[PDB]
Amino acid sequence: AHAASYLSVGYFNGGGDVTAGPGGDINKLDVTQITHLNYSFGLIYNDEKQETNPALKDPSRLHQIYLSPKVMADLQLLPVLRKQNPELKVLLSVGGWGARGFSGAAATAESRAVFIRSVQQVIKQYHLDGIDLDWQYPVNGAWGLVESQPADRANFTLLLAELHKALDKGKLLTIAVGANVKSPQEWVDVKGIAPYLDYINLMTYDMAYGTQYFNSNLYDSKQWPTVAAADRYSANFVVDNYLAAGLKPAQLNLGIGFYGRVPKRATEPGIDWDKADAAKNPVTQPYFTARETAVFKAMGLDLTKDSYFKYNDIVSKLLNDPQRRFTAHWDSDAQVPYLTMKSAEGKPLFAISYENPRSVALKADYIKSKGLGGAMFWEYGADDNNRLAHQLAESLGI
Ligand SMILES: CC(=O)N[C@@H]1[C@@H](O)[C@H](O[C@@H]2O[C@H](CO)[C@@H](O)[C@H](O)[C@H]2NC(C)=O)[C@@H](CO)O[C@H]1O
Ligand SMILES: [Cl-]
């Protein structure tokens, strides 16, 4: 009798990100192509002994939200953006990869109250529509990158329950959750937190690790198969794991990456920790020689430290490389594009996978077919003349 209404939630790296690098220019975004903007990131003043940002170490603001000068400046421009799209909803995202402070902020009644008061303050001062919590990750701590404890799982539920109670009705409360299967199994009580959340952003990307070639494949590749079971991920696999945990599809946004990654398999041996015979590890070996790593290093990508490549840089530096070193291909099973470069032998070497307009449209088709609530994307500053966001808007009828 009537058509569906989908979300398109665009993260924007405005203040800087540990993996994605310095923040970008908010004036370049087309805010008519999205329903929600997650401005990223607020940080958390914390007492973690390994914290290296001294501004977060101010003991008199422990557990409150830190906004850098650029973040404050961008947030003051929101009235201008709203004039271009009066329906736009703007949230502040607190956290991100490597962001400390959540475990301590969630731990006690007193600490949660300080954090919640700070959220309300930031929402009121900048006239925000709500708050997105991007904790990577409760319990696991991103494998020790941030402090964590097993009590984080129950403390996160209490923090969300108490924030939902404190926030004015009509303000939004959302979270991002990881692709790892252990997230719904061990880190986050998805069934217990669902009543408090307007929607949940699934980070269905960053899969190009271990023995897996693809960073954001919708389904598993067969031409370029992942070897170790513990590395075998796809956006669909992640969705099904969250559904099996008890989330309803309409509450979920499928995360879409406006970037690619050079797979770790290209430069580091891949280990299958479930191998019965340890003598058979590593099960994959690097296939980049110094020549290939030097190509990326000259473009500013040091593969010894990171593998993230913005989509607009894929277009300008790889697709349109003057020397024509990269050939684009389509993986019909994975439903995403990828690039190869030629080895000395003339053998094609899998260089990077990413998302193009075709693959974004196919992820929108999945959203519509599976009954998900919408799309989310990381991140708007990495789009190429707003083209991927525009494709999502067209495919979802935004
Ligand atoms: C399937 C899986 O769990 N892959 C892990 C990756 O998620 C992870 O990368 C990190 O993923 C976050 C999203 O969940 C990103 O916010 C973050 O930028 C990214 N970190 C880096 C350095 O790329 C990697 C890193 O530990 O491990 C995989 O196993
Ligand atoms: Cl392309």
Q: Which atom of ligand 1 is nearest to the CA of 143?
A: 26
For residue 204, give the amino acid letter: T
Pocket lined around ligand 1, Cβ cut-off 6 Å: 19, 97, 136, 143, 178-180, 203, 206-207, 209, 233
Q: After which residues does the chain become discontinuous at a C–N distance over 2.5 Å?
A: none
Q: What is the token pair recorded at 248?
A: 């309803």
Q: Do 172 and 162 contact (CB within 8 A), yes or no?
A: no
In this structure, are residues 121 and 66 in contact, taking their beta carbons and an 8 Å threshold? no
Indicate the top mutation candidate among 206, 241, 301, 307 to test ligand 1's pocket, ranked by most ligand atoms within 8 A of CB: 206
- Reading the block at residue 354, the tokens are 């990413």
Closest CA to 196 of 231, 161, 151, 223: 161
Atom of ligand 1 nearest to the CA of 20: 18
Is residue 158 within a helix (H) or strand (E), and if so which, with residue range?
helix 152-166
Residue nearest atom 6 of ligand 1, based on CA coordinates: 206
Residues 6+ apart with CB under 8 A from 223: 331, 333
Number of Cβ within 10 Å of residue 93's Cβ equals 26
Is residue 35 within 8 Å of residue 374, measured between CB atoms?
yes
Q: Atom 28 of ligand 1 has which residue's CA nearest to it?
A: 209
**Which atom from ligand 1 is nearest to the alpha carbon of 308?**
23
How distant, in Å, are the alpha carbons of 215, 251, 274, 339 from that of 307?
10, 31, 26, 14
Taking 3-state DSSP, the helix, strand and coil percentages for the chain, each rounded to the nearest 5, stand at 35, 20, 40
- Which strands form 259-261's sheet, in the order they lie side by side? 308-310, 259-261, 348-353, 336-342, 326-331
Q: Which fold has domain 258-354?
A: Chitinase A; domain 3 (3.10.50)
Encoding tokens for residue 206?
Answer: 């960053």
Query: 220: closest CA among 211, 233, 204, 205?
Result: 233
Return the sign of the alpha-carbon dihedral for residues 135, 164, 65, 45. negative
- Output the CA 314–ligand 2 centroid distance in Å: 9
In degrees, to the nearest 5, what angle opens at C-alpha 193 toward C-alphas 187 and 199?
Answer: 105
Q: How far away, in angstroms, is 356 Cα from ligand 2 center?
A: 5
With beta carbons less than 8 A apart as the criterion, state whether 32 and 85 touch.
yes
Query: What's the CA gap between 344 and 298, in Å, rounded?
Result: 18
- For ligand 2, the distance from its centroid to the CA atom of residue 223, given in whole angstroms, is 19
Q: Which helix (H) or strand (E) holds 71?
A: helix 69-76
**CA-closest residue to ligand 1 atom 15:** 97
Single out the residue of 206, 197, 172, 189 nearest to residue 97, CA to CA.
206
Q: Which atom of ligand 1 is nearest to 233's Cα?
A: 1
Q: What distance in angstroms lies between residue 337's CA and the mean position of ligand 2's atoms?
A: 7
Stated as kind and residue range, the H or E segment containing 202 is strand 199-202
Which residue's C-alpha comes closest to atom 27 of ligand 1?
Answer: 209
DSSP string, 28-54: G--GGG-SEEEEEEEEE----TT---G
Residue among 112, 224, 221 nearest 158 (CA): 112
- Measured distance CA(241)–CA(200) in Å, rounded: 14
CA 385 – ligand 2 centroid, Å: 14
CA 136 to ligand 1 center in whole angstroms: 9
Nearest ligand to residue 134 Cα: 1
SS3 197: coil
Burial class (CB in 10 A: 0-12, 13-18, 19+), 103: buried
Residue 277 C-alpha to ligand 2 middle, in angstroms? 41
Three-class SS state of 165: helix
User: For the CA atoms of the chain, what is the radius of gyration?
Assistant: 21
| Domain ranges (residues) in the chain | 1-257+355-398, 258-354
Task: Using alpha carbons, select from 205, 192, 196, 147 the residue that is nearest to residue 20.
Answer: 205
Contact of 33 with 12, CB cutoff 8 Å: no
C-alpha–C-alpha distance, residues 128 and 92, integer Å: 7
Find out whether the peptide bond into 41 is cis, omega within 30 degrees of 0: yes
Cα of 260 to ligand 2 centre, how many Å?
A: 12
- Identify the three-state secondary structure at position 18: coil
192 neighbors 159 (Cβ within 8 angstroms): no
What ligand has the least distance to the C-alpha of 20?
1
- For residue 111, the tally of other CB atoms under 10 A from its CB is 18
Q: What residues flank ion ligand 2 with Cβ within 5 A?
A: 356
Contact 397, 368 (CB under 8 A): no
Cα separation, 17 vs 324, in Å, equals: 31
Q: At 76, is the secondary structure helix, strand, or coil?
A: helix
Q: Report the relative pairing of strands 89-95 and 308-310 from DSSP bridges.
A: unpaired
Nearest atom in ligand 1 to 134's CA: 16
Domain 1-257+355-398 has CATH 3.40.50.2300: no
C-alpha 151/C-alpha 142 separation (Å) is 15
What is the CA(220)–ligand 1 centre distance, in A? 18
Q: Tokens 């805010």 identify what position?
A: 31
N-terminal to C-terminal alpha carbon distance within the chain: 19
Q: 305: number of CA atoms within 13 Å, CB side?
A: 9
The DSSP symbol for 295 reads: H
Do the Cβ atoms of 156 and 137 come closer than 8 Å? no
User: Using alpha carbons only, what angle is made at residue 361 by residues 27 and 316, rounded to the nearest 5 degrees?
Assistant: 50
Ligand nearest to the CA of 337: 2
Residue 130's DSSP bridge partners are 91, 172
3-state secondary structure 92-151: EEEECCCCCCHHHHCCCHHHHHHHHHHHHHHHHHHCCCEEEEECCCCCCHHHHCCCCCCC
DSSP structure string for 307-371: -EEEHHHIIIIIIT-TT--EEEEEETTTTEEEEEEE-TTS-EEEEEE---HHHHHHHHHHHHHHT
| ∠ Cα 142 144 150 (to 5°) | 80
Helix pair angle (109-126, 152-166), 10° resolution? 40
